[model samples]
Target: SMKIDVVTIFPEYLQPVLVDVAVHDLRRWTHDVHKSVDDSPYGGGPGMVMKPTVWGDALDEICTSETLLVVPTPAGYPFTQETAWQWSTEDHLVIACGRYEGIDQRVADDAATRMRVREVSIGDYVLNGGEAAALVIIEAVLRLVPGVSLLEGPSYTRPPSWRGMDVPPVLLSGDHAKIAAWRAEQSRQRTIERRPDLLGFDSP
Candidate 1:
């Protein structure tokens, strides 16, 4: 089984899903009563970056030779299906969920000394916290732990005709070949509409 660990200030944000995921509170490694984990940048900048001491200590305790440290950030390399498949093959993955501006730069620098570190960005947009991004990254990796067909066409259930819309009759036609053709065409059409980039085409 793949083992994933997420360290975040809001550990509750990361709920259970995959088999061996362990969520850790970043403040757990703090020595102070308030368990404060972040502060404004040294030279005076924008939002606070998490302190190295807390993340450093937490990572030191959790990471191992088998662990791949995955740091989620707006500035990180893009996380994609290719990245998910690559990560799914890893024995252990530790996700560092940053907040405010981000984690202290030194945290990953120090972690790199002990293990492979990957900084991942899920998309062009930003989120309030890395916990949601971590979940996104986790689900992408987990789903590929087995595999994926093309983006599935929109699905329908019994009571196919609800409101004014109805499940396409071909799906209910009972002819396997026709049903498959309908599903395949629907998949292609939807993919083209929403994810043109996913479709193969000649580059200019």
Candidate 2:
């Protein structure tokens, strides 16, 4: 029962829904003629913030005890491979996307009391909205489902040599132990050089 409900005003901005994924139209909760979900801030902010009224109603209808609400924002915790792996264990996921300036903070604060809530971010920079962030999460998490993802790394097939380069000699040697050691080193070296952050070597 790992159901996922995506709440977004721009539902059409998302791709075709996948198995176990559904879209909840945010506009449906609006009673106004324009079906607007955002409103001017009470304190007179530069941009509009999404109203909690429409979002709150939508969540009340969709969220259950098993739902884990993952919201994307620049100020949220950094999203990574480990986070995606952890989310794979959830029985239900609700990806809540906010627009305009952002969703009313009270909505998130309220939802926290009723369900598992996580505010996550894909990167350090900002985006136009959360729609892109939600899609990034969906692709990453779905790919990690048991038997759904393909494991691919330093691998080679026919035509080992191209131009002037060739596959590493140990890979061609065919000694199982030696090949294993070579691959392990390659993987480690690749990680060390390309993503020390993944290994917690955060600062230079």
Candidate 3:
């Protein structure tokens, strides 16, 4: 089983059950009277930048060589199913949830020297902090592990004919080959309508 850890100022936002998980308070590493984790940007930016010193202390104590450090940011590479599948194979995962303007860049730069570090963005839009993305990423990753199913398409159950809509006749037909083909087409059509951006082919 893999162990997961999340570092966040708003610990309440992240709550995952039935896993070996730990949530660390970022302020726990602070030493000052006010326990401050953010400071004015050095070049006079619009908002406070997370202090590197506090993040350094937290990461130093939490991360190990086997850990994959995931930093969620608006500027990071797109986080896709491939990323989650890769991370599901790891033995340890530590997600750093940054708030305010953002975390100091050096924190990730320095951590990369010792372990695998990834900065990932859940989507194109921005959010208040990384906790939400961390939750999305963690759930995606965990579901890919041994115990869960990975059907990305919609499911059907009883009351299929309810609300003037019938369950696709092909699904209920129970002809294995035809059912399989129908499912594949339905999945493809749904993706085309809702997520055409995911249709791109990988470069050779």
- In order, the Cα lDDT scores of the candidates are 0.87, 0.84, 0.89
Pairs with steric clashes in candidate 1? none
Q: Which residue pairs show backbone clashes in model 3?
A: none
TM-score of 1: 0.84
The root-mean-square deviation over C-alpha atoms between each candidate and the true structure, in angstroms, is 3.2, 3.0, 3.5
Residue range 1-204, candidate 1, lDDT tens digits: 688889998988887443588899888899999889989898987888789998989998999966899999999999988899898888899999999989889999988987899998999998977999999988988877753335688788889789989998987889999988888998998877777767874333
RMSD of 2: 3.0
TM values, all candidates: 0.84, 0.86, 0.87
The residue ranges of model 2 lying beyond 4 angstroms of the native Cα positions read 16-19, 146-153, 199-204
* CA shift of 116, model 3, Å: 1.6
Per-residue alpha-carbon lDDT of candidate 2 for residues 51-116, written as tens digits (9 for 90 to 100):
999988989988986689999998899998999899876778899998888899998899999888
Local distance difference test, candidate 2: 0.84
lDDT of 1 at 191: 76
